Amino acid sequence: MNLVLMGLPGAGKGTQAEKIVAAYGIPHISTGDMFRAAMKEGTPLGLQAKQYMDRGDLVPDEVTIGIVRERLSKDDCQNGFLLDGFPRTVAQAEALETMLADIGRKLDYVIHIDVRQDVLMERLTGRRICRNCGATYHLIFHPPAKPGVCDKCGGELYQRADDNEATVANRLEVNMKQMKPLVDFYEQKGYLRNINGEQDMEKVFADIRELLGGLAR
Ligand SMILES: Nc1ncnc2c1ncn2[C@@H]1O[C@H](COP(=O)(O)OP(=O)(O)OP(=O)(O)OP(=O)(O)OP(=O)(O)OC[C@H]2O[C@@H](n3cnc4c(N)ncnc43)[C@H](O)[C@@H]2O)[C@@H](O)[C@H]1O
Ligand SMILES: [Mn+2]
Ligand SMILES: [Zn+2]
């Protein structure tokens, strides 16, 4: 099962990816997470990606495609995989097609989680993450038991660097211009499936699981 989760910033990609991989046991490949890992390790790519991520811009295609190509060639991707946040430009999508062909694979579905921009704004500015364990909360939609305290480990909650309103507006703008044309690109290939992301988390997952069920049928 080869899947792509596509959505504008804050659509719920990570939230759903976690539920999907827990049910199937396939790897979760997130370009955003890979860039963050490189930043922490202090690698050349991490240092370059930091400047773009801090401003809410997209990391250049050549570099992004390169890290995905290296990740997909590993044996742990034999049973399938879930790409989260890649591709996000037409160039990345064209590259993904041949990258997959070279390893004898084809995408099954490109799941587009659709959410209105005004809602996306709120999804992101109110997000709080635990500094200790990475648990995610939301001040409006899913708050912690006690303010600024993680329910799981007691850790400090904080706001991601790129989640402030000004950076979010740039993120939504650039992703809208670059990612939206992908809806047409994948509709033409027949891989595109739309999911209404403005529903409670379990219902969004149910819609997704219903779609994935057609693969066993
Ligand atoms: N391919 C690429 N090419 C070039 N550059 C790239 C790249 N990929 C990455 N990058 C670079 O790296 C950066 C970061 O990438 P990335 O980390 O991938 O950021 P993103 O795509 O903007 O999206 P988010 O992670 O912020 O949100 P999400 O959709 O996963 O939502 P979540 O599930 O947490 O949910 C968000 C919030 O909403 C809440 N929530 C989720 N679902 C619901 C729901 N149904 N109802 C209510 N609340 C919900 C959650 O609790 C949470 O608080 C990019 O800006 C760019 O610089
Ligand atoms: Mn994410
Ligand atoms: Zn925690």
PDB file of C-alpha atoms and ligand atoms in Angstrom:
ATOM      1  CA  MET A   1       0.000   0.000   0.000  1.00  0.00           C
ATOM      2  CA  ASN A   2       1.634   3.200  -1.239  1.00  0.00           C
ATOM      3  CA  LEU A   3      -0.099   6.333   0.007  1.00  0.00           C
ATOM      4  CA  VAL A   4       0.330  10.099  -0.052  1.00  0.00           C
ATOM      5  CA  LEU A   5      -1.347  12.403   2.488  1.00  0.00           C
ATOM      6  CA  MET A   6      -1.764  15.844   0.961  1.00  0.00           C
ATOM      7  CA  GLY A   7      -3.094  18.953   2.680  1.00  0.00           C
ATOM      8  CA  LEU A   8      -2.435  22.605   3.404  1.00  0.00           C
ATOM      9  CA  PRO A   9      -0.636  23.358   6.684  1.00  0.00           C
ATOM     10  CA  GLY A  10      -2.777  22.422   9.676  1.00  0.00           C
ATOM     11  CA  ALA A  11      -5.173  20.174   7.731  1.00  0.00           C
ATOM     12  CA  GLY A  12      -4.477  17.243  10.089  1.00  0.00           C
ATOM     13  CA  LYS A  13      -1.858  15.264   8.121  1.00  0.00           C
ATOM     14  CA  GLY A  14       0.232  14.170  11.113  1.00  0.00           C
ATOM     15  CA  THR A  15      -2.826  13.458  13.256  1.00  0.00           C
ATOM     16  CA  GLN A  16      -4.244  11.069  10.662  1.00  0.00           C
ATOM     17  CA  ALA A  17      -0.872   9.592   9.617  1.00  0.00           C
ATOM     18  CA  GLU A  18      -0.327   8.363  13.181  1.00  0.00           C
ATOM     19  CA  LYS A  19      -3.691   6.559  13.190  1.00  0.00           C
ATOM     20  CA  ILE A  20      -3.052   5.065   9.764  1.00  0.00           C
ATOM     21  CA  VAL A  21       0.415   3.680  10.504  1.00  0.00           C
ATOM     22  CA  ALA A  22      -0.768   2.284  13.845  1.00  0.00           C
ATOM     23  CA  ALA A  23      -3.433   0.252  12.011  1.00  0.00           C
ATOM     24  CA  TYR A  24      -1.309  -1.091   9.143  1.00  0.00           C
ATOM     25  CA  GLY A  25       2.224  -1.157  10.468  1.00  0.00           C
ATOM     26  CA  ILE A  26       3.832   0.689   7.515  1.00  0.00           C
ATOM     27  CA  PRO A  27       6.434   3.501   7.777  1.00  0.00           C
ATOM     28  CA  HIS A  28       5.457   7.162   8.196  1.00  0.00           C
ATOM     29  CA  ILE A  29       7.630   9.327   5.974  1.00  0.00           C
ATOM     30  CA  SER A  30       7.245  13.059   6.766  1.00  0.00           C
ATOM     31  CA  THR A  31       9.507  15.559   4.994  1.00  0.00           C
ATOM     32  CA  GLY A  32       8.803  18.165   7.675  1.00  0.00           C
ATOM     33  CA  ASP A  33       9.878  15.734  10.405  1.00  0.00           C
ATOM     34  CA  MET A  34      13.002  14.723   8.452  1.00  0.00           C
ATOM     35  CA  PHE A  35      14.024  18.391   8.070  1.00  0.00           C
ATOM     36  CA  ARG A  36      13.476  18.987  11.779  1.00  0.00           C
ATOM     37  CA  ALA A  37      15.606  15.946  12.608  1.00  0.00           C
ATOM     38  CA  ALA A  38      18.418  17.269  10.403  1.00  0.00           C
ATOM     39  CA  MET A  39      18.227  20.677  12.107  1.00  0.00           C
ATOM     40  CA  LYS A  40      18.681  19.068  15.529  1.00  0.00           C
ATOM     41  CA  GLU A  41      21.596  16.906  14.315  1.00  0.00           C
ATOM     42  CA  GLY A  42      23.222  20.026  12.862  1.00  0.00           C
ATOM     43  CA  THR A  43      23.697  18.554   9.378  1.00  0.00           C
ATOM     44  CA  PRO A  44      24.300  20.679   6.242  1.00  0.00           C
ATOM     45  CA  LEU A  45      20.724  20.007   5.030  1.00  0.00           C
ATOM     46  CA  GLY A  46      19.338  20.817   8.476  1.00  0.00           C
ATOM     47  CA  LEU A  47      21.131  24.179   8.462  1.00  0.00           C
ATOM     48  CA  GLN A  48      19.810  25.047   4.994  1.00  0.00           C
ATOM     49  CA  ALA A  49      16.235  23.869   5.720  1.00  0.00           C
ATOM     50  CA  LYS A  50      16.090  25.938   8.906  1.00  0.00           C
ATOM     51  CA  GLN A  51      16.161  29.259   7.026  1.00  0.00           C
ATOM     52  CA  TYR A  52      13.152  28.313   4.851  1.00  0.00           C
ATOM     53  CA  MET A  53      11.169  26.618   7.622  1.00  0.00           C
ATOM     54  CA  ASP A  54      11.642  29.602   9.962  1.00  0.00           C
ATOM     55  CA  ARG A  55      10.133  31.897   7.288  1.00  0.00           C
ATOM     56  CA  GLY A  56       7.383  29.462   6.307  1.00  0.00           C
ATOM     57  CA  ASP A  57       8.808  29.014   2.815  1.00  0.00           C
ATOM     58  CA  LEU A  58       9.234  25.692   1.055  1.00  0.00           C
ATOM     59  CA  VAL A  59      12.684  24.039   0.990  1.00  0.00           C
ATOM     60  CA  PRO A  60      13.927  23.861  -2.674  1.00  0.00           C
ATOM     61  CA  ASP A  61      12.795  20.886  -4.762  1.00  0.00           C
ATOM     62  CA  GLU A  62      16.179  19.326  -5.631  1.00  0.00           C
ATOM     63  CA  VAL A  63      17.154  18.948  -1.959  1.00  0.00           C
ATOM     64  CA  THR A  64      13.719  17.716  -0.845  1.00  0.00           C
ATOM     65  CA  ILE A  65      13.479  15.159  -3.644  1.00  0.00           C
ATOM     66  CA  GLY A  66      16.951  13.912  -2.786  1.00  0.00           C
ATOM     67  CA  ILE A  67      16.109  13.067   0.827  1.00  0.00           C
ATOM     68  CA  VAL A  68      12.869  11.314  -0.117  1.00  0.00           C
ATOM     69  CA  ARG A  69      14.642   9.224  -2.771  1.00  0.00           C
ATOM     70  CA  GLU A  70      17.184   8.033  -0.170  1.00  0.00           C
ATOM     71  CA  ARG A  71      14.445   7.258   2.359  1.00  0.00           C
ATOM     72  CA  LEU A  72      12.248   5.263  -0.088  1.00  0.00           C
ATOM     73  CA  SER A  73      15.066   2.973  -1.190  1.00  0.00           C
ATOM     74  CA  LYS A  74      15.254   1.333   2.244  1.00  0.00           C
ATOM     75  CA  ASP A  75      13.937  -2.200   2.847  1.00  0.00           C
ATOM     76  CA  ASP A  76      11.435  -1.063   5.469  1.00  0.00           C
ATOM     77  CA  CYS A  77       9.351   0.344   2.614  1.00  0.00           C
ATOM     78  CA  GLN A  78       8.750  -3.056   0.989  1.00  0.00           C
ATOM     79  CA  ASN A  79       5.256  -3.519   2.551  1.00  0.00           C
ATOM     80  CA  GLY A  80       4.165  -0.022   1.568  1.00  0.00           C
ATOM     81  CA  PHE A  81       4.507   3.421   3.097  1.00  0.00           C
ATOM     82  CA  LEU A  82       2.752   6.654   3.896  1.00  0.00           C
ATOM     83  CA  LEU A  83       4.249   9.911   2.532  1.00  0.00           C
ATOM     84  CA  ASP A  84       3.171  12.910   4.639  1.00  0.00           C
ATOM     85  CA  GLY A  85       3.756  16.351   3.207  1.00  0.00           C
ATOM     86  CA  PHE A  86       5.470  15.127   0.044  1.00  0.00           C
ATOM     87  CA  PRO A  87       4.964  15.863  -2.735  1.00  0.00           C
ATOM     88  CA  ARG A  88       3.961  19.509  -2.425  1.00  0.00           C
ATOM     89  CA  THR A  89       4.948  20.931  -5.814  1.00  0.00           C
ATOM     90  CA  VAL A  90       4.381  19.680  -9.333  1.00  0.00           C
ATOM     91  CA  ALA A  91       8.118  19.100  -9.745  1.00  0.00           C
ATOM     92  CA  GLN A  92       8.135  16.918  -6.593  1.00  0.00           C
ATOM     93  CA  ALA A  93       5.154  14.939  -7.909  1.00  0.00           C
ATOM     94  CA  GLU A  94       6.759  14.281 -11.323  1.00  0.00           C
ATOM     95  CA  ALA A  95       9.935  13.191  -9.559  1.00  0.00           C
ATOM     96  CA  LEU A  96       7.980  10.890  -7.235  1.00  0.00           C
ATOM     97  CA  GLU A  97       6.460   9.104 -10.241  1.00  0.00           C
ATOM     98  CA  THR A  98       9.851   8.045 -11.671  1.00  0.00           C
ATOM     99  CA  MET A  99      11.382   7.471  -8.208  1.00  0.00           C
ATOM    100  CA  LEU A 100       8.641   4.927  -7.514  1.00  0.00           C
ATOM    101  CA  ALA A 101       8.908   3.403 -11.027  1.00  0.00           C
ATOM    102  CA  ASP A 102      12.635   2.775 -10.430  1.00  0.00           C
ATOM    103  CA  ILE A 103      11.769   0.587  -7.444  1.00  0.00           C
ATOM    104  CA  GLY A 104       8.826  -1.114  -9.143  1.00  0.00           C
ATOM    105  CA  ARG A 105       6.038   0.716  -7.331  1.00  0.00           C
ATOM    106  CA  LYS A 106       3.043   2.916  -8.130  1.00  0.00           C
ATOM    107  CA  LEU A 107       0.917   5.075  -5.825  1.00  0.00           C
ATOM    108  CA  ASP A 108      -2.415   3.661  -4.736  1.00  0.00           C
ATOM    109  CA  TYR A 109      -4.110   6.809  -3.397  1.00  0.00           C
ATOM    110  CA  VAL A 110      -3.306  10.477  -2.897  1.00  0.00           C
ATOM    111  CA  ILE A 111      -5.543  11.422   0.012  1.00  0.00           C
ATOM    112  CA  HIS A 112      -6.284  15.157  -0.049  1.00  0.00           C
ATOM    113  CA  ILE A 113      -7.553  16.352   3.340  1.00  0.00           C
ATOM    114  CA  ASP A 114      -9.493  19.528   2.535  1.00  0.00           C
ATOM    115  CA  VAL A 115     -10.050  22.290   5.096  1.00  0.00           C
ATOM    116  CA  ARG A 116     -10.965  25.995   4.721  1.00  0.00           C
ATOM    117  CA  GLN A 117      -8.158  28.498   5.215  1.00  0.00           C
ATOM    118  CA  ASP A 118      -9.775  30.388   8.083  1.00  0.00           C
ATOM    119  CA  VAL A 119     -10.022  27.159   9.987  1.00  0.00           C
ATOM    120  CA  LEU A 120      -6.411  26.235   9.086  1.00  0.00           C
ATOM    121  CA  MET A 121      -5.271  29.525  10.630  1.00  0.00           C
ATOM    122  CA  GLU A 122      -6.845  28.538  13.950  1.00  0.00           C
ATOM    123  CA  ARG A 123      -5.627  24.932  13.698  1.00  0.00           C
ATOM    124  CA  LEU A 124      -2.035  26.198  13.630  1.00  0.00           C
ATOM    125  CA  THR A 125      -1.895  29.262  15.892  1.00  0.00           C
ATOM    126  CA  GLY A 126      -3.548  27.399  18.763  1.00  0.00           C
ATOM    127  CA  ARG A 127      -1.381  24.276  18.482  1.00  0.00           C
ATOM    128  CA  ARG A 128       0.883  23.577  21.512  1.00  0.00           C
ATOM    129  CA  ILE A 129       3.445  20.762  21.651  1.00  0.00           C
ATOM    130  CA  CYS A 130       5.125  19.148  24.674  1.00  0.00           C
ATOM    131  CA  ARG A 131       8.807  20.031  24.886  1.00  0.00           C
ATOM    132  CA  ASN A 132       9.466  16.714  26.627  1.00  0.00           C
ATOM    133  CA  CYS A 133       7.544  14.022  24.795  1.00  0.00           C
ATOM    134  CA  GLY A 134       6.207  15.692  21.649  1.00  0.00           C
ATOM    135  CA  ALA A 135       2.527  15.208  22.567  1.00  0.00           C
ATOM    136  CA  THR A 136       0.288  17.635  20.622  1.00  0.00           C
ATOM    137  CA  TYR A 137      -2.550  19.732  22.030  1.00  0.00           C
ATOM    138  CA  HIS A 138      -4.731  22.527  20.823  1.00  0.00           C
ATOM    139  CA  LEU A 139      -5.855  25.431  23.005  1.00  0.00           C
ATOM    140  CA  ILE A 140      -9.250  25.633  21.276  1.00  0.00           C
ATOM    141  CA  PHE A 141     -10.000  22.123  19.956  1.00  0.00           C
ATOM    142  CA  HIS A 142      -8.175  19.770  22.332  1.00  0.00           C
ATOM    143  CA  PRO A 143      -6.621  21.504  25.392  1.00  0.00           C
ATOM    144  CA  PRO A 144      -4.492  19.949  28.148  1.00  0.00           C
ATOM    145  CA  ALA A 145      -6.089  19.170  31.561  1.00  0.00           C
ATOM    146  CA  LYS A 146      -3.946  21.930  33.072  1.00  0.00           C
ATOM    147  CA  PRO A 147      -2.727  25.028  31.112  1.00  0.00           C
ATOM    148  CA  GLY A 148       0.793  24.777  29.680  1.00  0.00           C
ATOM    149  CA  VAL A 149       1.316  21.297  31.153  1.00  0.00           C
ATOM    150  CA  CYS A 150       1.480  18.043  29.169  1.00  0.00           C
ATOM    151  CA  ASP A 151      -1.105  15.465  30.421  1.00  0.00           C
ATOM    152  CA  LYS A 152       1.239  12.597  29.591  1.00  0.00           C
ATOM    153  CA  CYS A 153       4.575  13.552  31.167  1.00  0.00           C
ATOM    154  CA  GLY A 154       4.033  16.830  32.990  1.00  0.00           C
ATOM    155  CA  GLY A 155       6.298  18.600  30.505  1.00  0.00           C
ATOM    156  CA  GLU A 156       6.235  22.245  29.350  1.00  0.00           C
ATOM    157  CA  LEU A 157       4.018  23.010  26.338  1.00  0.00           C
ATOM    158  CA  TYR A 158       5.231  25.534  23.742  1.00  0.00           C
ATOM    159  CA  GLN A 159       4.325  26.904  20.332  1.00  0.00           C
ATOM    160  CA  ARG A 160       6.261  25.719  17.288  1.00  0.00           C
ATOM    161  CA  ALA A 161       8.458  28.501  15.807  1.00  0.00           C
ATOM    162  CA  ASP A 162       6.565  28.604  12.509  1.00  0.00           C
ATOM    163  CA  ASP A 163       3.075  28.538  14.138  1.00  0.00           C
ATOM    164  CA  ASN A 164       2.827  32.252  14.912  1.00  0.00           C
ATOM    165  CA  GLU A 165       0.177  34.129  12.889  1.00  0.00           C
ATOM    166  CA  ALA A 166       2.528  36.000  10.532  1.00  0.00           C
ATOM    167  CA  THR A 167       4.508  32.893   9.556  1.00  0.00           C
ATOM    168  CA  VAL A 168       1.292  30.871   9.196  1.00  0.00           C
ATOM    169  CA  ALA A 169      -0.127  33.381   6.677  1.00  0.00           C
ATOM    170  CA  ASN A 170       2.998  32.951   4.559  1.00  0.00           C
ATOM    171  CA  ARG A 171       2.821  29.142   4.908  1.00  0.00           C
ATOM    172  CA  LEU A 172      -0.780  29.025   3.734  1.00  0.00           C
ATOM    173  CA  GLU A 173      -0.035  31.316   0.797  1.00  0.00           C
ATOM    174  CA  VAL A 174       2.952  29.424  -0.583  1.00  0.00           C
ATOM    175  CA  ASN A 175       1.367  25.980  -0.027  1.00  0.00           C
ATOM    176  CA  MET A 176      -1.834  27.128  -1.681  1.00  0.00           C
ATOM    177  CA  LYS A 177       0.078  28.223  -4.813  1.00  0.00           C
ATOM    178  CA  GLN A 178       2.355  25.183  -4.984  1.00  0.00           C
ATOM    179  CA  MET A 179       0.231  22.339  -3.670  1.00  0.00           C
ATOM    180  CA  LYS A 180      -3.220  23.097  -5.063  1.00  0.00           C
ATOM    181  CA  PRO A 181      -2.298  22.410  -8.694  1.00  0.00           C
ATOM    182  CA  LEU A 182      -1.519  18.834  -7.474  1.00  0.00           C
ATOM    183  CA  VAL A 183      -5.263  18.169  -7.063  1.00  0.00           C
ATOM    184  CA  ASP A 184      -5.642  18.422 -10.832  1.00  0.00           C
ATOM    185  CA  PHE A 185      -2.404  16.491 -11.471  1.00  0.00           C
ATOM    186  CA  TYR A 186      -3.568  13.467  -9.445  1.00  0.00           C
ATOM    187  CA  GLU A 187      -7.213  13.646 -10.532  1.00  0.00           C
ATOM    188  CA  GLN A 188      -5.912  13.116 -14.061  1.00  0.00           C
ATOM    189  CA  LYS A 189      -3.965  10.057 -12.894  1.00  0.00           C
ATOM    190  CA  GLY A 190      -6.989   8.774 -11.050  1.00  0.00           C
ATOM    191  CA  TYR A 191      -5.154   8.561  -7.711  1.00  0.00           C
ATOM    192  CA  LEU A 192      -6.876  11.535  -6.078  1.00  0.00           C
ATOM    193  CA  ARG A 193      -9.440  11.017  -3.257  1.00  0.00           C
ATOM    194  CA  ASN A 194     -10.885  13.953  -1.304  1.00  0.00           C
ATOM    195  CA  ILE A 195     -11.565  13.786   2.444  1.00  0.00           C
ATOM    196  CA  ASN A 196     -13.465  16.480   4.339  1.00  0.00           C
ATOM    197  CA  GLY A 197     -10.987  17.469   7.073  1.00  0.00           C
ATOM    198  CA  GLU A 198     -13.450  19.707   8.964  1.00  0.00           C
ATOM    199  CA  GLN A 199     -14.878  16.861  11.049  1.00  0.00           C
ATOM    200  CA  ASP A 200     -13.902  15.408  14.384  1.00  0.00           C
ATOM    201  CA  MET A 201     -10.679  13.391  14.310  1.00  0.00           C
ATOM    202  CA  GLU A 202     -12.313   9.958  14.581  1.00  0.00           C
ATOM    203  CA  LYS A 203     -14.755  10.712  11.768  1.00  0.00           C
ATOM    204  CA  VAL A 204     -11.952  11.900   9.494  1.00  0.00           C
ATOM    205  CA  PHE A 205     -10.165   8.625  10.254  1.00  0.00           C
ATOM    206  CA  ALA A 206     -13.331   6.609   9.615  1.00  0.00           C
ATOM    207  CA  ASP A 207     -13.683   8.225   6.171  1.00  0.00           C
ATOM    208  CA  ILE A 208     -10.068   7.392   5.425  1.00  0.00           C
ATOM    209  CA  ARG A 209     -10.323   3.806   6.701  1.00  0.00           C
ATOM    210  CA  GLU A 210     -13.451   3.366   4.573  1.00  0.00           C
ATOM    211  CA  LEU A 211     -11.508   4.433   1.485  1.00  0.00           C
ATOM    212  CA  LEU A 212      -8.511   2.228   2.302  1.00  0.00           C
ATOM    213  CA  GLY A 213     -10.915  -0.672   2.716  1.00  0.00           C
ATOM    214  CA  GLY A 214     -11.536  -0.682  -1.018  1.00  0.00           C
ATOM    215  CA  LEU A 215      -7.971  -1.954  -1.465  1.00  0.00           C
ATOM    216  CA  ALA A 216      -8.716  -5.265   0.265  1.00  0.00           C
ATOM    217  CA  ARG A 217     -11.973  -5.656  -1.664  1.00  0.00           C
TER     218      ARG A 217
HETATM  219  N1  LIG B   1       7.702  18.529   0.546  1.00  0.00           N
HETATM  220  C1  LIG B   1       8.292  19.672   0.954  1.00  0.00           C
HETATM  221  N2  LIG B   1       8.857  20.547   0.115  1.00  0.00           N
HETATM  222  C2  LIG B   1       9.419  21.690   0.508  1.00  0.00           C
HETATM  223  N3  LIG B   1       9.450  22.025   1.801  1.00  0.00           N
HETATM  224  C3  LIG B   1       8.910  21.192   2.726  1.00  0.00           C
HETATM  225  C4  LIG B   1       8.323  20.023   2.292  1.00  0.00           C
HETATM  226  N4  LIG B   1       7.823  19.334   3.322  1.00  0.00           N
HETATM  227  C5  LIG B   1       8.112  20.058   4.413  1.00  0.00           C
HETATM  228  N5  LIG B   1       8.761  21.182   4.048  1.00  0.00           N
HETATM  229  C6  LIG B   1       9.275  22.279   4.881  1.00  0.00           C
HETATM  230  O1  LIG B   1       9.117  21.945   6.263  1.00  0.00           O
HETATM  231  C7  LIG B   1       8.108  22.816   6.838  1.00  0.00           C
HETATM  232  C8  LIG B   1       7.197  22.093   7.829  1.00  0.00           C
HETATM  233  O2  LIG B   1       6.497  20.982   7.218  1.00  0.00           O
HETATM  234  P1  LIG B   1       5.306  20.214   8.067  1.00  0.00           P
HETATM  235  O3  LIG B   1       5.912  19.922   9.391  1.00  0.00           O
HETATM  236  O4  LIG B   1       5.044  19.079   7.160  1.00  0.00           O
HETATM  237  O5  LIG B   1       4.220  21.266   8.122  1.00  0.00           O
HETATM  238  P2  LIG B   1       2.858  21.379   7.450  1.00  0.00           P
HETATM  239  O6  LIG B   1       2.731  20.695   6.148  1.00  0.00           O
HETATM  240  O7  LIG B   1       2.659  22.827   7.239  1.00  0.00           O
HETATM  241  O8  LIG B   1       1.693  20.941   8.329  1.00  0.00           O
HETATM  242  P3  LIG B   1       1.626  20.795   9.818  1.00  0.00           P
HETATM  243  O9  LIG B   1       2.597  19.820  10.345  1.00  0.00           O
HETATM  244  O10 LIG B   1       1.928  22.023  10.552  1.00  0.00           O
HETATM  245  O11 LIG B   1       0.221  20.336  10.181  1.00  0.00           O
HETATM  246  P4  LIG B   1      -0.470  19.022   9.853  1.00  0.00           P
HETATM  247  O12 LIG B   1      -1.299  18.985   8.633  1.00  0.00           O
HETATM  248  O13 LIG B   1       0.308  17.788  10.025  1.00  0.00           O
HETATM  249  O14 LIG B   1      -1.438  18.971  11.115  1.00  0.00           O
HETATM  250  P5  LIG B   1      -1.590  18.316  12.561  1.00  0.00           P
HETATM  251  O15 LIG B   1      -1.962  16.915  12.342  1.00  0.00           O
HETATM  252  O16 LIG B   1      -0.522  18.583  13.512  1.00  0.00           O
HETATM  253  O17 LIG B   1      -2.807  19.201  13.079  1.00  0.00           O
HETATM  254  C9  LIG B   1      -2.633  20.600  13.342  1.00  0.00           C
HETATM  255  C10 LIG B   1      -3.389  21.009  14.587  1.00  0.00           C
HETATM  256  O18 LIG B   1      -4.799  20.836  14.413  1.00  0.00           O
HETATM  257  C11 LIG B   1      -5.258  19.849  15.357  1.00  0.00           C
HETATM  258  N6  LIG B   1      -6.180  18.936  14.646  1.00  0.00           N
HETATM  259  C12 LIG B   1      -5.925  17.951  13.768  1.00  0.00           C
HETATM  260  N7  LIG B   1      -7.074  17.420  13.313  1.00  0.00           N
HETATM  261  C13 LIG B   1      -8.031  18.107  13.934  1.00  0.00           C
HETATM  262  C14 LIG B   1      -9.430  17.962  13.787  1.00  0.00           C
HETATM  263  N8  LIG B   1     -10.021  17.056  12.995  1.00  0.00           N
HETATM  264  N9  LIG B   1     -10.187  18.838  14.487  1.00  0.00           N
HETATM  265  C15 LIG B   1      -9.658  19.759  15.311  1.00  0.00           C
HETATM  266  N10 LIG B   1      -8.348  19.857  15.474  1.00  0.00           N
HETATM  267  C16 LIG B   1      -7.505  19.070  14.756  1.00  0.00           C
HETATM  268  C17 LIG B   1      -4.065  19.169  15.965  1.00  0.00           C
HETATM  269  O19 LIG B   1      -4.315  18.880  17.358  1.00  0.00           O
HETATM  270  C18 LIG B   1      -3.002  20.245  15.839  1.00  0.00           C
HETATM  271  O20 LIG B   1      -3.042  21.126  16.979  1.00  0.00           O
HETATM  272  C19 LIG B   1       7.370  23.403   5.670  1.00  0.00           C
HETATM  273  O21 LIG B   1       6.797  24.646   6.014  1.00  0.00           O
HETATM  274  C20 LIG B   1       8.521  23.596   4.700  1.00  0.00           C
HETATM  275  O22 LIG B   1       9.351  24.667   5.203  1.00  0.00           O
HETATM  276 MN    MN B   2       2.621  17.516  10.247  1.00  0.00          MN
HETATM  277 ZN    ZN B   3       4.819  15.463  27.380  1.00  0.00          ZN
END
